Design an enzyme around this catalytic site. Sequence first.
Site, PDB file in Angstrom:
ATOM      1  N   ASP A  58      33.777  47.772  55.170  1.00  0.00           N
ATOM      2  CA  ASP A  58      33.288  46.497  54.666  1.00  0.00           C
ATOM      3  C   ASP A  58      32.454  46.708  53.405  1.00  0.00           C
ATOM      4  O   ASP A  58      32.353  47.816  52.875  1.00  0.00           O
ATOM      5  CB  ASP A  58      32.572  45.715  55.770  1.00  0.00           C
ATOM      6  CG  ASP A  58      31.195  46.275  56.139  1.00  0.00           C
ATOM      7  OD1 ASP A  58      30.697  47.201  55.476  1.00  0.00           O
ATOM      8  OD2 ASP A  58      30.601  45.761  57.116  1.00  0.00           O
ATOM      9  N   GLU A  93      36.175  36.656  54.578  1.00  0.00           N
ATOM     10  CA  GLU A  93      36.301  37.982  55.175  1.00  0.00           C
ATOM     11  C   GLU A  93      37.643  38.647  54.923  1.00  0.00           C
ATOM     12  O   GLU A  93      37.728  39.871  55.035  1.00  0.00           O
ATOM     13  CB  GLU A  93      36.060  37.916  56.689  1.00  0.00           C
ATOM     14  CG  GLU A  93      34.658  37.484  57.065  1.00  0.00           C
ATOM     15  CD  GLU A  93      33.589  38.530  56.777  1.00  0.00           C
ATOM     16  OE1 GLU A  93      33.922  39.690  56.440  1.00  0.00           O
ATOM     17  OE2 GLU A  93      32.401  38.184  56.929  1.00  0.00           O
TER      18      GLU A  93
END
Length: 164
Positions: free
Chosen positions: A20, A11
């Site tokens: 994202d 991440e």
Amino acid sequence: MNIFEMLRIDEGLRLKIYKDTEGYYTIGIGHLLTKSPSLNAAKCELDKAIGRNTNGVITKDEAEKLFCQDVDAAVRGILRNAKLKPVYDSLDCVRRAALINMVFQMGETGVAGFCNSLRMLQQKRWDEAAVNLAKSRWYNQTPNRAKRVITTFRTGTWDAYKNL
Ligand code: NA
Ligand code: NA
Ligand code: NA
């Protein structure tokens, strides 16, 4: 290697609001704020999550605190899910981290619907499960991450996270 280090690799860590891989406002270690296209909506989510007026920026400690919460919410959602719990319970500690990783990224509902992959994991048919998991939007849209998670399911080792 452990679930925290593994998700930190997958991440990243960013201290300002970012989009994202799906285009959604996020902060920290993959903390999804909202699917709304409104940055203002994301900012309300952030201030509420942190408990202060952040102006879209947080500290590393704050990011790690959201991450603590988010990893646990992935585990809690697995354990509450009638399709995922039996699979999770059947797995060893390393493969459990692979399942947590998937749920962290895509949510309980989506993973819980992969009835063939879940069956193959429960059956401990590791190569077959690995092949089947790759027949997914997940694999095609985030192939490098999916390959690492799949190798974790295939081998029960952390080998795909070495040198990262
Ligand atoms: Na809010
Ligand atoms: Na649940
Ligand atoms: Na197999």
